[PDB]
């Protein structure tokens, strides 16, 4: 029902993957339970869970942000943020780290017409053949709409939010593509989409997640702020 978003103001835009790597690195050894809980690890092992992650990372314009889902997510972010703040203060002795703590109510109500919803970061590259299928809407709609529907239903079930039984979505398109890597020296990269616009006949309150593999910082979007239509101020 409640989503907690915490932003650490480091002063520079850090990509979410390196952010998660470094926050893992800072908490090595001290308070192992916090590390296991924050990294989405099975108790007793360091492996991650295939299930939807309750721990969330995102790329803030001024830094990186922690997102908790549900009471468990809220509780973990609440007892976690002082520790990561202390670690960041320890590592960066000559910079002030600022913490912004804001909560979003999560609500999804139906609506007999559609609204323009978009995201900056979709994980859509599965096969190279499907990548060229985006020229025709009909061929590429099936897997994209299926991905959106499954992502929405699984995140709703994870957060326990009621959703209508009659959601239909049609895709519009994206702005461009981008490449992302595990490490700067890694030779493995994936393709995402920026401005992937799709129309849904329902309202989405608060911040929302779509796609899969979200903990590394993909598929987060504030649907509520997008409805304000502040995307007009994009020019040079």
């Amino acid at each position: 029902m409640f989503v907690t978003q915490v932003i650490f103001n480091m002063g520079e835009r850090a990509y979410p993957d390196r952010a998660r790597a470094m926050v893992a690195e800072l908490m090595d050894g001290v308070q192992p339970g916090l590390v296991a809980t924050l990294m989405n690890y099975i108790p007793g092992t360091s492996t991650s869970r295939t299930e939807f992650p309750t721990v969330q990372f995102g790329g803030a314009s001024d830094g990186f942000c922690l997102l908790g889902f549900g009471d468990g997510g809220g509780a973990i972010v609440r007892d976690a943020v002082p520790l990561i703040h202390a670690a960041l203060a320890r590592r960066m002795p000559d910079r002030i780290i600022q913490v912004e703590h804001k909560e979003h109510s999560l609500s999804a109500e139906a609506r007999p017409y559609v609204l323009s919803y978009t995201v900056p970061r979709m994980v859509v590259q599965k096969k190279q053949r499907h990548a060229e299928r985006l020229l025709h809407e009909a061929e590429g709609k099936a897997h994209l709409e299926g991905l959106f529907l499954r992502s929405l239903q699984r995140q709703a079930a994870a957060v326990g939010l009621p959703l209508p039984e009659n959601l239909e979505v049609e895709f519009k398109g994206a702005v461009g593509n981008f490449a992302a890597k595990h490490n700067p020296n890694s030779k493995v990269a994936y393709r995402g989409l920026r401005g992937a616009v799709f129309d849904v006949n329902a309202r989405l309150g608060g911040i929302w997640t779509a796609g899969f593999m979200l903990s590394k910082g993909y598929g987060q979007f504030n649907a509520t702020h997008q409805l304000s239509g502040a995307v007009n101020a994009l020019s040079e």
Binding site: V81, H85, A86, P93, D94, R95, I96, I97, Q98, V99
Partner: protein, 324 residues
């Protein structure tokens, strides 16, 4: 002897009504639960009966300044601006009990409970100051009646009368003022600013962690308070029970020097500033652009001057003395 003072305030008047009333956004009094809620400080109001061009009498709230506040304002203005310089010229020192009694009507919370000798009663009542207010350990009835600052309004016609109907205001005269409280944490962006702070950025981050961990109070507070809007005209009514010339002159001097004092509340925000527009003495206007002056008022000023240049602290120390 009735005194009516036409007061126009050039800054909002803020007399806080006791109690934690809560407001939402867009100024809804006592909002339905669930919406955002913030503590609102309501301005002091008195319910009065008035007919709003309907003919039926009904009780409606009216934002006023309580009469006790105006009485204390008159007392303080008189003391600071008239009596205290007179005592300082003669280098006469008031005892601590005398000072407390003159400034709050009593030197302690325990009244004496016994009456006064007649000579002492008349001596204290004939005094230019103590006669007006009275008080003391043994209770004394002052000569001064101070009424509340009633705003001239369609709700005040049944109270003040139709004499000042030309200055009435139809709509409401209260507004909500919103205030914040910002932490220093937001305005730190560089350690160069924090060169004045102990421990530097490390200590600052430690303090912010303490704030997020165990403080909850904290230095962040969004709140609001209701103020009476500026420019509304007020009527102040003062009555005296058979005064001497010196007491009337003292009251007139206090009215002359009253404009230098605020009415109530909002010292930080310059609230309570006013200008005395018209002073009426027994149905006759004695006010002048300079102030309270004229041939009809010369005798009062002469009498109060003759009382001031020859007064001492003996009366005050006798008045404050307790018989227990």
């Amino acid at each position: 002897m009735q005194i009516e003072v036409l007061i126009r305030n050039i800054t909002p008047i803020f007399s806080a009504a006791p109690g934690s009333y809560y407001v939402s956004l867009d100024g809804t009094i006592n909002p339905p639960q669930g919406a955002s809620r913030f503590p609102l400080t309501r301005a002091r109001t008195m319910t009065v009966v008035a007919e709003t061009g309907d003919g039926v009498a009904k009780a409606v709230p009216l934002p006023i300044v309580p009469g006790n506040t105006m009485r204390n304002l008159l007392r303080r203005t008189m003391l600071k601006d008239v009596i205290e310089p007179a005592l300082r010229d003669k280098s006469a020192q008031l005892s601590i009990g005398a000072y407390a009694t003159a400034y709050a009507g009593n030197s302690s919370g325990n009244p004496d409970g016994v009456p006064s000798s007649f000579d002492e009663i008349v001596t204290m009542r004939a005094h230019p100051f103590l006669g007006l207010f009275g008080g003391g350990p043994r209770m004394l009835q002052g000569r001064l009646m101070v009424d509340s600052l009633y705003p001239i309004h369609q709700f005040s016609q049944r109270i003040i009368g139709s004499d000042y109907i030309n200055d009435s205001i139809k709509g409401g005269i209260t507004e909500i003022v919103w205030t914040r409280r910002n932490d220093p944490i937001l305005q730190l962006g560089s350690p160069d600013d924090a060169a004045v702070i102990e421990g530097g950025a490390q200590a600052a981050n430690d303090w912010i962690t303490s704030l997020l961990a165990t403080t909850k109070r904290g230095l962040k507070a969004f709140n609001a308070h209701e103020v009476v809007i500026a420019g509304v005209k007020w009527l102040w009514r003062i009555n005296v029970d058979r005064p001497s010339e010196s007491q009337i002159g003292l009251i007139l001097l206090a009215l002359n020097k009253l404009a230098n004092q605020r009415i109530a509340g909002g010292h930080a925000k310059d609230y309570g500033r006013f200008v005395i527009e018209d002073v009426i003495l027994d149905g006759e206007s004695v006010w002048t652009p300079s102030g309270v002056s004229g041939q009809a008022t010369e005798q009062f000023f002469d009498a109060i001057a003759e009382a001031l240049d020859g007064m001492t602290s003996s009366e005050f120390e006798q008045f404050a003395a307790s018989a227990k």
